[PDB]
Structures are given as structure tokens and as C-alpha cells.
Amino acid sequence: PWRLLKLEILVEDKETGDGRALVHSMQISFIHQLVQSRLFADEKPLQD
Amino acid sequence: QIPSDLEGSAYIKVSIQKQAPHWQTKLEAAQNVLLCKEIFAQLSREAVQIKSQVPHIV
């Protein structure tokens, strides 16, 4: 299977997010686990 | 610890064209950023809401 070495979110607005990142690394790591799990589901993986 | 949204430096820039002590520096810069945000909020609200001759674009 595939490993998800680094996931990053490029969506940014430096005003709504109060001069900080839009998504904290906690939530990015959560999505990292979720997409790693659905990679381990072993379908056609890249579409999912 | 300064609030985020107040870091960096900001300044109002006004132009005319024919076209279409360590902590002291930090706290002064953040206070200046706060006042520039206050100024521009006042200006943009008066531009949008107050009816004036030859209206503006914000």
C-alpha cells in the first residue's frame, strides 16, 4: 500500500484565520490518519 | 505574547495617480498595527455606507 508521508492544506486567508494557519496540525494529522486508513482499505486508492 | 492578527508591521499608504527595549519594539509595532486597522475600518465603512459625491470602491 501507499504511505502518506506529508499532507498539507494550501487554502489560506490571513484574516479569517487570525494571522495564523487555517487548520491546526492536530486536524491535519487527523485527516492523515483517515486517508491512511482509506488507503489501507485497498480499493483503487488514488480516486478515494 | 502578542495576539496573532497583530504581528508584523502595517501602515496606511496614500497615493495620487493619473491612472485607471526588546518588548518595547514588539508592543509599539502591534499597537501601531491596531491603530492602522482602526483607521481603515473607519475609512472603508464610510466609503461603503455614507452617500457621497463621486462614490468609491473598496
From Swiss-Prot, chain A:
It is found in: Nucleus. Ubiquitous. Transmembrane segments: none annotated. It comes from the Eukaryota. Component of the Mediator complex, a coactivator involved in the regulated transcription of nearly all RNA polymerase II-dependent genes. Mediator functions as a bridge to convey information from gene-specific regulatory proteins to the basal RNA polymerase II transcription machinery. Mediator is recruited to promoters by direct interactions with regulatory proteins and serves as a scaffold for the assembly of a functional preinitiation complex with RNA polymerase II and the general transcription factors. Interacts with GATA1. Component of the Mediator complex, which is composed of MED1, MED4, MED6, MED7, MED8, MED9, MED10, MED11, MED12, MED13, MED13L, MED14, MED15, MED16, MED17, MED18, MED19, MED20, MED21, MED22, MED23, MED24, MED25, MED26, MED27, MED29, MED30, MED31, CCNC, CDK8 and CDC2L6/CDK11. The MED12, MED13, CCNC and CDK8 subunits form a distinct module termed the CDK8 module. Mediator containing the CDK8 module is less active than Mediator lacking this module in supporting transcriptional activation. Belongs to the Mediator complex subunit 14 family. This is Mediator of RNA polymerase II transcription subunit 14. It comes from Homo sapiens (Human). The gene is MED14.
Curated annotation (Swiss-Prot), chain B:
It is found in: Nucleus. Ubiquitous. Component of the Mediator complex, a coactivator involved in the regulated transcription of nearly all RNA polymerase II-dependent genes. Mediator functions as a bridge to convey information from gene-specific regulatory proteins to the basal RNA polymerase II transcription machinery. Mediator is recruited to promoters by direct interactions with regulatory proteins and serves as a scaffold for the assembly of a functional preinitiation complex with RNA polymerase II and the general transcription factors. Belongs to the Mediator complex subunit 17 family. It is linked to Microcephaly, postnatal progressive, with seizures and brain atrophy: A disorder characterized by postnatal progressive microcephaly and severe developmental retardation associated with cerebral and cerebellar atrophy. Infants manifest swallowing difficulties leading to failure to thrive, jitteriness, poor visual fixation, truncal arching, seizures. There is no acquisition of developmental milestones and patients suffer from marked spasticity and profound retardation. Progressive microcephaly becomes evident few months after birth. Interacts with GATA1 and PPARG. Component of the Mediator complex, which is composed of MED1, MED4, MED6, MED7, MED8, MED9, MED10, MED11, MED12, MED13, MED13L, MED14, MED15, MED16, MED17, MED18, MED19, MED20, MED21, MED22, MED23, MED24, MED25, MED26, MED27, MED29, MED30, MED31, CCNC, CDK8 and CDC2L6/CDK11. The MED12, MED13, CCNC and CDK8 subunits form a distinct module termed the CDK8 module. Mediator containing the CDK8 module is less active than Mediator lacking this module in supporting transcriptional activation. This is Mediator of RNA polymerase II transcription subunit 17. The lineage of its organism: Eukaryota, Metazoa, Chordata, Craniata, Vertebrata. The gene is MED17. The chain holds residues 246 to 326 of 651 of the full protein.
